[PDB]
Ligand binder design. Structure first.
Ligand SMILES: *[C@@H]1O[C@H](CO)[C@@H](O)[C@H](O)[C@H]1NC(C)=O
Ligand code: NA
Lengths: 39, 251, 34
């Protein structure tokens, strides 16, 4: 029941790894969209 | 999404697919917050460790989608980017602090039964909902497991985790601009976001006004669906002041 | 632009029709610090 996130505004060796593909998986099986959009 | 299920039609009308023009690829999840403003993670457009740096002309946004792969004509719509706004204090070097970016579309998107924006939380709504144990909803087309890819959009409900538990779960420095979510081993159930889901929305339904608010952005994790590890989400509400400075200046 | 657009968070195929999705009950029923 504790606040998992503070309720204020951001008045302004180990690296986090984003949940982002790295080995080209985002192109698997993708059906080509109309060429008019590709410009 | 690990341990999710198939989304229902129109269950997530704010889900956007950030899409690479050439090669045609899925880049990231994203969320629709207005007629021409899409929220995503900053590392989807700028991640130097992997030499990622996309400009507005490289990318498109596909709104209203369900299938990951099929071009869904007459239902999905595809918009172009006018400008990208990455948080000025986004730090990719250590812990993806302020992992957030905005994309303004060239032309306002037409809403439908499958294209609809999500709300951003006010101080009152955020305070009552961002509490450990309360469950939000994560959506994406990413990996179904860490150790392959769904045919349609995936949804999983995950609980907010206490900050002390998030801090102790990893050696990486946690900041106040992120929270973590997922089940503990004692809780039995499973679920997580995974690579390909980042930039997508963590949303919560308000018991006050029946609206959906986006509380988080899929940012990072250590593997997917690991006992004692949790996925980390950009804390949208802490950054909401910046989000508004961009939509009021350049709106 | 505070919380967003006037119609935000209300889905055409659910809230605008008074229909629930299949798992949204699980979300509401977690709103209990127990
Ligand atoms: C990303 O690319 C743009 C070119 O449009 C460049 O001006 C900018 O400095 C780059 N940012 C990096 C490499 O961090
Ligand atoms: Na886990």
């Amino acid at each position: 029941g504790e606040p998992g996130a503070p309720i204020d505004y951001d008045e302004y060796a180990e690296v986090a790894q984003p949940k982002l593909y790295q080995r080209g998986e985002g192109g698997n099986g993708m059906e080509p969209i109309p060429e008019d959009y590709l410009q | 999404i690990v341990e999710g299920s198939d989304a229902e039609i129109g269950m997530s009308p704010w889900q956007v697919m950030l899409f690479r023009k050439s090669p045609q690829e899925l880049l990231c999840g994203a969320s629709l917050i207005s007629d021409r403003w899409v929220l995503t993670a900053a590392h989807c457009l700028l991640y130097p460790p992997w030499d990622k740096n996309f400009t507005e002309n490289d990318l498109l946004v596909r709104i209203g989608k369900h299938s990951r792969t099929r071009y869904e004509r007459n239902i999905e719509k595809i918009s172009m980017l006018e400008k990208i706004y990455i948080h000025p204090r986004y730090n990719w070097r250590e812990n993806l602090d302020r992992d957030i970016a905005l994309m303004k579309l060239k032309k306002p998107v037409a809403f439908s039964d499958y294209i609809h924006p999500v709300c951003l939380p006010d101080r009152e709504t955020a305070a009552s909902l961002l509490q450990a144990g309360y469950k939000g909803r994560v959506t994406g087309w990413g990996n179904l497991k860490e150790t392959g890819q769904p045919s349609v959009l995936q949804v999983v409900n995950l609980p907010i985790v206490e900050r002390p538990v998030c801090k102790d779960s990893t050696r990486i420095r946690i900041t106040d601009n992120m929270f973590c979510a997922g089940y503990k081993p004692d809780e039995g159930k499973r679920g997580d976001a995974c690579e390909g889901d980042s930039g997508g929305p963590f949303v919560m339904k308000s018991p006050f006004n029946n609206r959906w608010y986006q509380m988080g952005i899929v940012s990072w994790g250590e593997g997917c669906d690991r006992d004692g590890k949790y996925g980390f989400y950009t804390h949208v509400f802490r950054l909401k002041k910046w989000i508004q400075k961009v939509i009021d200046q350049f709106g």
